[PDB]
Amino acid sequence: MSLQLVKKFQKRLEDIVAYGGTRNESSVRAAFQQLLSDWAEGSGLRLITEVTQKAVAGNNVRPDGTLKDSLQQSRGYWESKDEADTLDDEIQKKLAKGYPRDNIIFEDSRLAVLMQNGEEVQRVDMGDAGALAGLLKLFFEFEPPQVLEFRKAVDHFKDEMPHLLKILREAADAAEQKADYRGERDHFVEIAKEAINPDFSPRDAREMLIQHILTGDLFTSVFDNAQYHEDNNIAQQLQQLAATFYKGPVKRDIAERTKRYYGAIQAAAAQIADHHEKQRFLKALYENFYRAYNPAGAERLGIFYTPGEIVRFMIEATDTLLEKHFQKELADKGVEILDPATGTGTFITELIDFLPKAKLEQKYREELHCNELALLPYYIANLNIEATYAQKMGRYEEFRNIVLVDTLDNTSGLFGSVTAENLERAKRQNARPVRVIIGNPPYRANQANENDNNKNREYKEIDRRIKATYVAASTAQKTKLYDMYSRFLRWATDRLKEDGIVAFVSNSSFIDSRTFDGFRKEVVKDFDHIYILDMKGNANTSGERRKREGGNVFNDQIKVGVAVYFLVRSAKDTKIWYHAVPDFWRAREKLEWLKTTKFEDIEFDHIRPDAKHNWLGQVDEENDWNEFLPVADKDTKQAKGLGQERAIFKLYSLGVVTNRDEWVYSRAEDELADKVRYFIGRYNEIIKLPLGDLMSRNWEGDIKMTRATIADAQSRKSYSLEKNSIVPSLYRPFDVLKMYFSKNLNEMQYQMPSIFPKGVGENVVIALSGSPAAKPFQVLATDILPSLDLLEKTQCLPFYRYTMNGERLNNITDYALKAFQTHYAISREDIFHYVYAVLHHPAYREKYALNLRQEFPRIPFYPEFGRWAAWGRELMALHIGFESVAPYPLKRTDEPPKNDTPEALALAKKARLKVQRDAAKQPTGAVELDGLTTLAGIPAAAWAYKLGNRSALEWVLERHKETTPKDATIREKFNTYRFADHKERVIDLLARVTTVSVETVRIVGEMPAETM
Amino acid sequence: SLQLVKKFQKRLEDIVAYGGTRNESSVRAAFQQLLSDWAEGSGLRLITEVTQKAVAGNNVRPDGTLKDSLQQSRGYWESKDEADTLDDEIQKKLAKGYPRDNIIFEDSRLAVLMQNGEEVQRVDMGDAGALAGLLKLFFEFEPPQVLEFRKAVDHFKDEMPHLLKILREAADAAEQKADYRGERDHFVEIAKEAINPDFSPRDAREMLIQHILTGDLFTSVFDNAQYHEDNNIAQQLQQLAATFYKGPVKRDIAERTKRYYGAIQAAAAQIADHHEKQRFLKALYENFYRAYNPAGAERLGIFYTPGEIVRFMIEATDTLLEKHFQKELADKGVEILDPATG
Amino acid sequence: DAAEQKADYRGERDHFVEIAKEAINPDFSPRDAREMLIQHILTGDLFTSVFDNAQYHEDNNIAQQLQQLAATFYKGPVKRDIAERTKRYYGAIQAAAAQIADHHEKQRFLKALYENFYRAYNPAGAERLGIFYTPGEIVRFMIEATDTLLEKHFQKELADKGVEILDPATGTGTFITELIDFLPKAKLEQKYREELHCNELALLPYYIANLNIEATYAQKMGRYEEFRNIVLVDTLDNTGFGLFGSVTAENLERAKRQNARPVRVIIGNPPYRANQANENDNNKNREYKEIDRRIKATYVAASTAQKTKLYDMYSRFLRWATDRLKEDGIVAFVSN
């Protein structure tokens, strides 16, 4: 909408007067007619032209157009006049005949006014696309006052949701005193463990009852279909469960107390009639309920709303692809559709709207099907599709096609036998030959934290198939093809009996993720045409990448990337089309695009998979990146000595993974001591805890129990504190912190011991950015232990290699020396400094940027060799002993705390380390250290040297600012360092880094303009 | 095509649904938008409520006229209310003076196409395939001007011998001016090393008669006078033609060749599609050599390729580029050369 | 406007302004120069498309001095761009005009360009020049009535060799083209070659008249001959019977030759303008030293009126006519 539609209006107004040769209203009025109509068709209204209206003056005033709702109610009006007449003197003439004045766009071909509520809200020039876009926004968004009251009431319900849920929770606690309730509750948890969750817990049945009551009250209060809960199979079952307890004075007690929460919303929803306006309360309840009840279960279910724009685009596109490929149509008999996840019932509510009224009966009765896992969704959905059908046609008819089943587990079996009717339709759906599978599957890879203890429900006969297919062909180490969305994809590739479409909106990871390499190769053998529309929006990125990704198509609620994909399998090769939305784009823009763009007219570049099955980011082959190798898996896994040696190094180390950075690191060893005390002490207490509680993790969450630790406490063995294991280490660029480096508090130590044994070993490591690398390729050489959070996937490349019995034999490969001496007729020592400067070469880091973010940086033989080894020498030494290089002259001034209050002084001693930039964010060479200390004397070359998204200086400043330990046990029950005690040392460290940067810049600057 | 007709049906049902009116004034916006969008693809545009004087002097205003870039009507449309009799309303409107050359008498239910004063096709608007056929015929009706241009192109072929007599006499009367002989001698010697080692003054008089003939029709029938002004090779041959073709010499030749150029210019000016006018370029090409140098036509080869062969050969080279070189004709890097353009 | 970003145009433009500050008007300004350029580019397009006389400019002395100015910017992509945009106005007229053979039907477009260009571009300059067209009926009547009095008082006809007819203000060329249609074919050749003369001050009128006259002759005779008797000169300044008319060298010859021809009949519709409407317009009538001085000695000196409005442009063109008729003849005019 917005610019896209307003720019088409501008072009079509010109072509009317050009092709016709007339500037009269009756001809030129067909340009704004199409602008308004097409805008309305995406907003869910329709501009019907020339509709007569009996006014208070007794005249059937006929305005040029009437914006109307699905309930035939006039919301807005439009009167177009010719450029010849004066708009202002003709508005008065029409308004004096009794023309409506509540929402009317009086418009000439060059000017447009909006008389909202009787007063000109805005007068714009139609030549300016942005101005007209804003005017029409206000016109199509103006709602009558009753609608606005309901809106505010829905907002207020979200505020009261936790409080009414508290009252309902108290009532469910009292239910335990009675044994009649606990009788049918125990029967229910048994019958539910046989159909929904094999691990159904008592708490799960409790939430499932709170849902029956809350939603049962709001199906009589806000909406007026109380009979739904008296005609629904699932409702009747949990109605008995509730009745056993919730009844008589208990029912009345809750009702009277909660009558205040459910009163305001009822008063407002009595005025509203259109279901399309009332269904929005259900969307709010859908999300806010789980927010204020089971947030961890909300993560496992992906309780989210799919904006109507995304659903209407997919429904429209599926129709076009059903004609282009299967010569059929969505409203044709035999094209049955299933939804793997109904949620708030949108993908099927909007299908009802799209389908003709004539063919709506058949499709509703036996050709539209959906599934749901939770109860609130099941109800919210069924209510919606029943009321939508009734509004569109004019007759109420219960939907007999929603089944409450885990679609992933229902693949025989009593999965779905919560009630008899439920299982009847669970097996009926599996019999129906469904052609289209549309939806928004839950996306969940891994889990939030091991402390959260919310793992993904393991799916048998689904992970079985992904293992035989996607994971099989995958060559990546950490295959995250176990995400709930990849499982939903594999289930659907199967559900599709012969030919059809799997149109889903999911994580964009499939388009370009190392783990999903197998999916990219397997899916092309499972489908015939693949159409991907990347909506970008990955906010799990940083720097220029973040701005490029832009806002998320889900109203900036999620942080992952999104992609509307349409996978069609026909009845040659597979045609992989692709269209990414523009970069630096906001959510509103992406959503307006989807609302108006027609699938037919979308530019789709045809991507051709390369040998590595990389659909996107195809590497150039002209570039000669075929030169040596820094490290290759074969060099490391070697037993031939120099036989398979084909690189420059022979040990690939990854930075220590701590898995609990808060407990393993500290600013001073004095604090680490007591931190490791509490941790191991609590583990030693946990191993005494009974085997049962230990196994079920029914313990305390004060310590960050990680995978290995839990299994160690499972052998009930014990640990010990050792102050020798603790050593200084780099976890962040130019920031050294004391680390435990114990096998007990370090989950994955990797091959780091073989570089610096317990930190004692002397070694120089060329740290590298691993593949893939979202942040620009970074490289640095140090002498203290690195972690995986220093550089993106830090891959340390050592100088020497300490062997089993303590022998520091040079790690550097001999093949290199034997391949380098031939080329340039040298010394392994300087060859180390040499490669550092080859990675320091700008043209190399820029021309081969794509290649570098795919594999280990292959090193080109460099003519000079001596000059590169000298370049690298100073560079390496400068970044190793950065702590003691040179105090760059830094102008230091302290400020007074103005009014001498204890607060003012203490406040101006907080960590206010802010880079002072100016105009368009350009550093002015000043850096407030705290409120008092204000540093300066910083050259712009200091800010130029970047070791990632931030500069070498910004990295230091960042880790010198105070933080709030995300770990609650460290946040208050442990240490909280200040900056008023570190300010002096920071000034010194800053000064060193300032010189370090200008020296790096100097060296880098003398490099050739060409790469080999 | 089918897609647009499916959207037409989706709008007609939602106008009577969201608006609750069956009045023609409101239900006509569905067909208006169907025709408007089909037209935008065919290079035409549907302008609405355009008045037109009928034969008896009654201004009649159809509900929409299809106009070309030259602001000329090439089709019409009149929608009525379904609560009526289409055949009865067609007859009354036709009797008011309504044009019958190409008109769609629309009713929310059915539509008839009266082309050339005679019903050609009556369909039901509830059919997405039948309305697509009726509309294809309405938007591909050959107007009188297209047929009268093809007649003129055929007649120019027969009058080319006589037209080339006027131009031959001119190039002969130029061989008396020493300015021409001097320039011609320079051209023959720069074309004896560039085009043919045996370029003769006879070959140069041919290139002149071609530059003159085409430098009149390019500015009249094709309206591209600038082509000759900016074309690299045309500037070299205008340097040989401006030694004589100017002032009263040009005025005499122009007044004697106007009888052969008059008709094509009349018809061509009413055609906007270059695809229609390109049949004249094909006829000038073949017939010039048949009337002037029938022998050089044998040496060079002067037969154009039927478009059906060229379109197949282009579509097939694309299928074969994909199957063997995994590329497409549109992909960057696929350089195409036509050794003998014609 | 985009052409003034090129030093070559600014150079040629500056040379032209200086030349026309001694040939057309002492105060020729950049505004007048750019009007002349816009007129050249507009007439160029329409004369090649609707009137099929592209050669007109390549045989017109004035057109070749003004194509020097236009050749600096109007060529290649610049011309191809303005052409694609302007085709949406020229399209319809071109289509219909190509199916019209009679120039007497196509001369209605010439009248429209003349009266509407000024009304849309320079309404002020239209007032000072008097851009209006004489209805054919009036023109025809005067041509017939002049022949009547030529036979009554001079025993001659308009077709008789010796009667040199001069139109002091041609406009669209109506008077000369209607004389071509009256004069017999056997005598038209000599008259068109040395007895029909005319003068214009504005460029659009000059071009429109030259084409109208040359094409009316062509239709009647069957052959196209160039009219070498049209001069772009201020009639009330070319009283040198001098640098007036020196826009080009041929125009100066034509001016000096015309000021020696023995004129018998001065037919025409002189411009009328007594005063400017409001002082804020700053569009007063130009001062013509010689004519004004002769009006003062003759008309004004013999008038017993307090207010003299005898410096009207029509009164100035009547004094000139009396003086131009050196011996005998008729001054046939239509005026206030």
Add this chain to the structure above:
DNA sequence: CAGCCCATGGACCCAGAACCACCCACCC
């Protein structure tokens, strides 16, 4: 080594005839 044998497939076009439109003689 310059005569002397040996192939080998070729960038259309134009007379019969059909049939059609129009008008005149010819039956009807």
Add this chain to the structure above:
DNA sequence: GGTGGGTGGTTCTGGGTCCATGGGCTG
């Protein structure tokens, strides 16, 4: 009042040649 016939136009349709001229021989 057709009908055949005289006259001129307008489509189709069917149906097919001697002879250039490079190369290998060849005495």
Add this chain to the structure above:
DNA sequence: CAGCCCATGGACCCAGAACCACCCACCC
């Protein structure tokens, strides 16, 4: 001589006002 008086006729244009055309509403 500049600083007062005294004339004297002026190269259109545009708001109603029909009056149609078409068609929704309103009777009929």
Add this chain to the structure above:
DNA sequence: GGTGGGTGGTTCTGGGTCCATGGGCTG
């Protein structure tokens, strides 16, 4: 089914102002 508004386009048709600016005084 006419019939009168509603809305927009498409022809006539009627009907009419302050104020430039040279020349003549004039003191």
Add this chain to the structure above:
DNA sequence: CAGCCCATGGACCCAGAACCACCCA
């Protein structure tokens, strides 16, 4: 053979900045 190295992207939230009344100093 089963504990031990590698990976690899991850269904938002949060300081902090206008800005908004809002009297009211």
Add this chain to the structure above:
DNA sequence: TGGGTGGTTCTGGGTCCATGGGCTG
């Protein structure tokens, strides 16, 4: 007349680490 006051919505901008699969052993 800022300014305090005291919230109160827009808005840009980025993490450590779960945890399955090869892999010698």
